[PDB]
Design a protein around this ligand. Structure first.
Ligand SMILES: [Mg+2]
Ligand SMILES: [Mg+2]
Lengths: 34, 109, 52, 324, 141
RNA sequence: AGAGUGUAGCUUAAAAGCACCCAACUUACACUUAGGAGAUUCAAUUGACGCUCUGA
RNA sequence: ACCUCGGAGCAGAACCCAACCUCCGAGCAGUACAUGCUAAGACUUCACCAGUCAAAGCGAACCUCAAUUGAUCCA
């Protein structure tokens, strides 16, 4: 079983990882094009 | 050595060309494969024959082909089609002539 | 191979319809529409008319 | 023979030997989108349609969206798929912002413009809130093409159009019993002093809708005209007749249609009372008559036809005996 | 009686007359193509990258009613305009707009995956509870 | 120093559509479902903040 | 050697076309038991026989297959 607080923290974890790896792929593609 | 091949012609094909007045139920075209696809107010029999579902004028058009999502073979064909490509097929439509009916004064209560 | 079997209505009606089944399968029972009763009723295989 | 195409053949530009390199529709959804776009696009061959056919606002909206995102409870509900929307507030904002356009679309679909104004259109900028008082407690609103029974429409409606000289006109578009191209005027309040409507001039008294029985669904339109400068206007059915097109042709310079609201009505016992008492007539009853079934010319020898063939052409089902 | 002068044949010009009477034609063909045209009003849902569109469109193609999360009114009341919440909210708004428009029946034609989609299920439930039946009456012949 | 100048990656889009990413299904991809971020450089059509080119 | 049936060429495009011409096949199988009852209008193997499709309606639920067959009498 689990709780609302940890579920919210996991959702925010997924959100921040989405942002982080989006920036990673953006910089990778920028280097590729350059 | 070669036996058979004596079958006669099926006499299939178009029975009503464009511009022909067609009554409900009339067979527009009989085909072995789907040469002409059913358009508006045109139904398909078990044997792929096209019959007019309404009373009107037959019109042949070229229309984009969008197969049913469960038609697996056609869906695979589309999935393999290049982007920007659109399939077209010949459709038979029956443009209804008469209205469904009229409102008539029956009783002046 | 299959056989043609006369399925008879269990509704007491003398309604029979012929179906086909494998010769090596058990005696066949269906739920078929009985026009006399105007309702789906159980039909049980009674006899084998012919082997097809 | 091979006549050349009269235009760009479909799938011509893309076609090239680099099929392997070309990206492909991996999804029936994207293929369907492209196919629908192509179908909408015009073509030179016979087709189905031929035969059957500011910055402040942006800044404020961005700030509001940022505030909503910041509100954690909103994000919690969104990720828990439990958040809802205030329907009444959404409706009010729709009215204020984009309601006129959707209402114009509804009017065009219902054919109000093609009938009331012979095609000429207009965005109903001014919202028009009409409601027929039901009982002494509630009231049925008339938004756009909704259904209101003549019983409910028995008494004149309450109108609240928020503005600051107006003319209100109720027109039945298809209730005419004698003329296909004609209207019925039910009430015409001219030179109304702003929001308040009781002070309007009663050019024609209110007459409740009377859609004849079995005559189908009728459409009734509330036309509100903003009146630039006040102007003078000019139970008998011959004088209740009306042509809104001609009326607006006469009053176009001083009038501008700024509000619209219509509803649909079908026959009712109140219609019976309207016909018998108010109009003093025998109510007409209409029926939908389908065309007689088509049968091919009777042949002397109906080869291979079933015995029902003769019944298809006999007119009387009762036995007949000729000279005997 | 002059008021009793009635033409023998009534001419109801309302486009929705026969449709509401359940007597109008509805294209019965197109059996080899998707979606079916056999309807009077269709509920079409478009899920773009950012937004969600819900149209009530007559068979002739006219967009009778629309509800887009692209409108300020709706987009200013939900967190994301591309989620199940957005789909349910836009479905409820469309249901209200349809009821005020007089459209009570429609034909929804989802693909198998769209039907299996949770967002589409929520939108259909929202329309149903708002009072729109996604199943048109059979034509009367 | 001079020219082209200018919406998030692309758009003879007007704040949109395609793009793009992780999560689940896939060996995997793809599809699909769920979610994610996103811009009209700054001031009055004009001027100046950033990018490319022509030179030293 | 063949005799009946179907598909493809001959017969490029409405239909139809011979051959002791060229090639393929069939004499079922599978699933279902509403593969129930009715009925407009049509197709038709160049006749007839036979064979096909089918709106609407009642009653319900919410057929695949190219050929895959055989009349009458009589049992
Ligand atoms: Mg042959
Ligand atoms: Mg013949």
């Amino acid at each position: 079983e689990l709780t609302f607080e940890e579920t919210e923290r996991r959702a925010l974890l997924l959100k921040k990882w989405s942002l982080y790896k989006q920036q990673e792929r953006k910089m990778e593609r920028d280097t590729i094009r350059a | 050595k070669n036996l058979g091949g004596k079958s006669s012609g099926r006499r299939q094909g178009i029975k009503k060309m464009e511009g022909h007045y067609v009554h409900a139920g009339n067979i527009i075209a009989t085909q072995r494969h789907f040469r002409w696809h059913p358009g508006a107010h045109v139904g398909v029999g078990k044997n792929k024959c096209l019959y007019a579902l309404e009373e009107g004028i037959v019109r042949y058009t070229k229309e984009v082909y969008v197969p049913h999502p469960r038609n697996t073979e056609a869906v695979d064909l589309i999935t393999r089609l290049p982007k920007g490509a659109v399939l077209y097929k010949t459709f038979v439509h029956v443009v209804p002539a008469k209205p469904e009916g009229t409102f008539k004064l029956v009783a002046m209560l | 191979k299959n056989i043609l079997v006369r399925m008879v209505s269990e509704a007491g009606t003398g309604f029979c319809f012929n179906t086909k089944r494998n010769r090596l399968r058990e005696k066949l029972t269906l739920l078929h529409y009985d026009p006399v009763v105007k309702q789906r009723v159980l039909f049980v295989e009674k006899k084998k008319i012919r082997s097809l | 023979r091979r006549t050349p195409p009269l235009g760009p053949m479909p799938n011509s530009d893309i076609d090239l030997s680099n099929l392997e390199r070309l990206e492909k529709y991996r999804s029936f959804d994207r293929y369907r989108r492209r196919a629908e776009q192509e179908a909408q696009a015009p073509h030179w061959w016979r087709t189905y349609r031929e035969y059957f056919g500011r910055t402040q606002q942006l800044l404020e909206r961005k700030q509001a969206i940022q505030e909503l995102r910041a509100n954690v409870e909103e994000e919690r509900a969104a990720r828990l798929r439990t958040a809802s929307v205030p329907l009444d507030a959404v409706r009010a904002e729709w009215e204020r912002t984009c309601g006129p356009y959707h209402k114009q679309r509804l009017a065009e679909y219902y054919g109000l413009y093609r009938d009331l104004f012979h095609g000429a259109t207009f965005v109903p900028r001014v919202p028009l809130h009409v409601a027929y008082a039901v009982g002494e407690d509630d009231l049925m609103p008339v938004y756009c093409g909704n259904e209101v029974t003549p019983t409910e429409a028995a008494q004149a409606p309450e109108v609240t159009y928020e503005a600051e000289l107006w003319t209100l006109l109720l027109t039945s578009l298809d209730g005419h019993l004698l003329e296909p191209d004609a209207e019925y005027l039910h009430w015409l309040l001219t030179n109304i002093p702003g929001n308040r409507v009781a002070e309007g001039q009663v050019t024609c008294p209110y007459l409740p809708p009377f859609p004849a029985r079995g005559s189908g669904i009728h459409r009734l339109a509330f036309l509100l005209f903003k009146q630039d400068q006040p102007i003078d206007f000019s139970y008998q059915l011959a004088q209740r007749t009306f042509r809104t097109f001609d009326f607006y042709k006469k009053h176009q310079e001083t009038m501008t249609p700024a509000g619209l609201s219509f509803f649909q009505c079908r026959w009712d016992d109140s219609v019976t009372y309207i016909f018998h008492q108010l109009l003093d007539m025998r109510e007409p009853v209409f029926e939908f008559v389908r065309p007689p079934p088509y049968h091919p010319k009777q042949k002397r020898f109906p080869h291979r036809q079933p015995l029902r063939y003769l019944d298809r052409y006999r007119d009387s089902h009762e036995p007949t005996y000729g000279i005997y | 009686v002059e008021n009793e002068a009635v033409a023998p044949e009534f001419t109801n010009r309302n486009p929705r007359n026969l449709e509401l009477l359940s007597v109008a034609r509805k294209e019965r063909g197109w059996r080899t193509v998707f979606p079916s045209r056999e309807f009077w009003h269709r509920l079409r849902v478009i899920r773009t990258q950012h937004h969600v569109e819900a149209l009530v469109e007559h068979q002739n193609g006219k967009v009778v009613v629309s509800a887009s999360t692209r409108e300020w009114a709706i987009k200013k009341h939900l967190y994301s305009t591309r989620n199940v919440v957005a789909c349910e909210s836009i479905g409820r708004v469309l249901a209200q707009r349809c009821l005020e428009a007089g459209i009570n029946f429609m034909v929804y034609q989802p693909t198998p995956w769209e039907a299996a989609s949770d967002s589409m299920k929520r939108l259909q439930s929202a329309m149903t509870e708002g009072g729109v039946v996604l199943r048109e009456p059979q034509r009367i012949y």
